[PDB]
């Protein structure tokens, strides 16, 4: 005659760090699959996207100071950028600063092309070498 599940939420709201649980107060499994201290927050995702628009792809050292203060694995960036553009070889886009409007298109475009070619795995287009 106690609902533990509800009890969990309100506690999780005032007690647990913002990353740990969702606004509703549910607990977000994203934080818990990633190693601790390595979590990639929505908010600093916006920052990656913003960083590409300002400094361009493969500008990580320049991009890194501005948006991720320490901050983050230089590799994680490039891997995440591969995701933004929907390709798995990001080489083609390097040194080009791309607007958020355009990252959306490239990703949209790259994926459609991958789907037709039947070389899209995990929602990322695979690129021939």
């Amino acid at each position: 005659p106690l609902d533990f599940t509800q009890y969990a939420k309100n506690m999780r709201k005032d007690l647990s760090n913002q990353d740990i649980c969702l606004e509703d107060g549910a607990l977000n499994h994203s934080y818990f699959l990633t190693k601790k201290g390595q979590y990639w927050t929505p908010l600093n995702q916006k920052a990656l996207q913003r960083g590409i628009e300002l400094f361009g792809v493969g500008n990580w050292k320049e991009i890194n100071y501005d948006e991720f203060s320490g901050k983050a694995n230089i590799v994680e960036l490039e891997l995440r950028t591969c995701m933004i553009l929907g390709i798995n070889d990001i080489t083609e886009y390097y040194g080009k600063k791309i607007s958020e409007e355009e990252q959306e298109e490239i990703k949209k475009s790259n994926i459609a092309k991958g789907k037709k070619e039947n070389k899209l795995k995990d929602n990322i287009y695979q690129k021939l070498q």
Binding site: L2, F4, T5, Q6, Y7, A8, N10, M11, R12, D14, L15, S16, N17, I20, A26, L27, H29, S30, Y31, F32, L33, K36, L79, C82, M83, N88, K121, D122, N123, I124
Partner: protein, 217 residues
């Protein structure tokens, strides 16, 4: 070989692309949904906030508490700081568990008594090879560590069931350092569906209905 190394790299990024994708799709955490992890350092922690909320959403206090203090596990807190934690506020009518390395065994005793507990039982944990444990004991080699249990208040109440568990525990040392799973079962015998706490808690050991505080969560 350049070609092989180039090969692994792309094979590897794909997993990430896969995983980051499933996560997007709601892939579950290992953690049970009902657990309530909190990340803090106890020294930093104000326990008032925890008490206010617990009273607020349960109108109750913790049935059980557990501990693996990081004596000078192994996060090197000042011995006094552990001792001087305000555990007494945290629970009013319940059991406490605490893991004492042979070095701290007496000191631990003195510690629970200070917080007002009465020592009633000790759990023993053996490390079966799968069957025996090799420990570089100061006088006698150690093949166990042990959980010291103390009580305060009325457990004559229905919730705690006497004679429901055993002193000895039998498990392998998974994910060392990791405590045996079966402790949480044994706590189910003692308490069924009771509000539990744990301090100094690892990510691996989170369970439903269990509050947990550690700085690695």
């Amino acid at each position: 070989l350049l070609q092989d190394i180039e090969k692994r790299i792309l094979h590897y990024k794909q997993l990430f692309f896969k995983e980051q994708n499933e996560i997007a799709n709601g892939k579950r955490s290992m953690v049970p949904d009902n657990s309530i992890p909190i990340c803090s350092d106890v020294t930093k922690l104000n326990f008032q906030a925890l008490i206010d909320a617990q009273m607020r959403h349960a109108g109750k206090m913790f049935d059980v508490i557990m501990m693996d203090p990081p004596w000078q596990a192994y996060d090197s807190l000042s011995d006094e700081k552990i001792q001087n934690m305000p555990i007494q506020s945290l629970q009013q009518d319940g059991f406490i568990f605490v893991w004492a390395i042979n070095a701290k065994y007496r000191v631990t005793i003195k510690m629970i008594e200070n917080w007002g507990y009465k020592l009633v039982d000790e759990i023993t944990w053996v490390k079966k090879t799968v069957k025996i444990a090799k420990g570089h004991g100061f006088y006698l080699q150690h093949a166990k560590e042990s959980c010291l249990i103390g009580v305060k208040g009325d457990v004559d109440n229905g919730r705690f069931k006497k004679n429901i568990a055993s002193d000895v525990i039998f498990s392998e040392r998974r994910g060392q350092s990791q405590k045996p799973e079966e402790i949480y079962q044994y706590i189910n015998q003692l308490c069924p569906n009771g509000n539990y706490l744990e301090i100094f808690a690892r990510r691996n050991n989170l369970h439903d209905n269990w509050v947990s505080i550690g700085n690695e969560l």
